[PDB]
Amino acid sequence: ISNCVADYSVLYNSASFSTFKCYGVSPTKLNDLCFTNVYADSFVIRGDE
Amino acid sequence: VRQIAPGQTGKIADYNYKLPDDFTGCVIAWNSNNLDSKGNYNYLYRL
Determine the Cα–Cα distance for residues B47 and B33; give it in Å rounded to an integer. 23
State the nearest Cα–Cα gap between A37 and chain B, in angstroms: 25
Determine the Cα–Cα distance for residues B37 and B33; give it in Å rounded to an integer. 6
**Interchain proximity B14–A13, CB inside 8 Å:** yes
Which whole-number Å values give the CA distances from B11 to A31, A32, B36, B41, in the listed order? 16, 19, 22, 19
Nominal resolution (angstroms)? 2.9
CA A45 centroid distance within chain: 19
How many Cβ pairs within 8 Å bridge chains A and B? 10
Q: Using alpha carbons only, how large is chain B's radius of gyration in Å?
A: 13
CA nearest to A9, candidates B12, B9, B13? B9
Name the E strands within chain A. none
Q: Are A9 and B14 in contact (CB under 8 A)?
A: no
